[PDB]
Amino acid sequence: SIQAEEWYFGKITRRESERLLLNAENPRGTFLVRESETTKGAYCLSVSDFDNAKGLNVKHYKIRKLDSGGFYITSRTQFNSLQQLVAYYSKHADGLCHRLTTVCPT
Ligand SMILES: *C(=O)c1ccccc1OP(=O)(O)OCc1ccccc1
């Protein structure tokens, strides 16, 4: 089901996620989910941001998945699915650079 998600890019590198997100047309919150390069079993949420100090830039957030079933960036805020995690962060910025807006174009 995760592999079926249009925002799930699978096995792409961190640099590739940055190449895709650093497009001048991408508004704040453009995002994608990929596998972590070095953490087995973990995903990575790559998100674009923009401000006058840094200009267009990218942030990465590790998503952990417990055998017990929960998905989360912070253990205080867990979800029953990756889909629910993405939906929540599309409404709440919380500690992220921006709420998730649009799926990163390829
Ligand atoms: C996403 O998993 C993530 C989160 C924060 C920094 C980088 C990052 O991408 P990774 O593909 O996991 O690889 C780089 C990394 C650097 C430092 C610690 C963990 C991952």
Q: What technique determined this structure?
A: X-ray
Which candidate, 49, 29, 48, 34, places its Cα nearest to that of 100?
A: 29
Look at residue 87 and give its three-state secondary structure.
helix
Distance 21 CA to ligand 1 centre (A): 16
Q: How far is CA 55 from the centre of its chain?
A: 19
84 touches 69 (CB < 8 A)? no
Q: Confirm or reject: Cβ of 1 under 6 Å from ligand 1.
A: no
Query: Measuring from atom 17 of ligand 1, which residue has the nearest CA?
Result: 38
Query: Do β-strands 8-10 and 31-35 pair in parallel, antiparallel, or remain unpaired?
Result: parallel
Q: Token pair 């990465």 is at which residue? A: 60
Resolution of the entry in angstroms: 1.6
Please give the DSSP secondary-structure letter assigned to residue 103. Answer: B
Question: Residues, the chain, total?
Answer: 106
Domains and CATH numbers, the chain: 1-106 (3.30.505.10)
Please give the DSSP secondary-structure letter assigned to residue 105. Answer: P
Distance between CA atoms of residues 73 and 83, nearest Å: 13
Distance 13 CA to ligand 1 centre (A): 10
Distance 15 CA to ligand 1 centre (A): 11
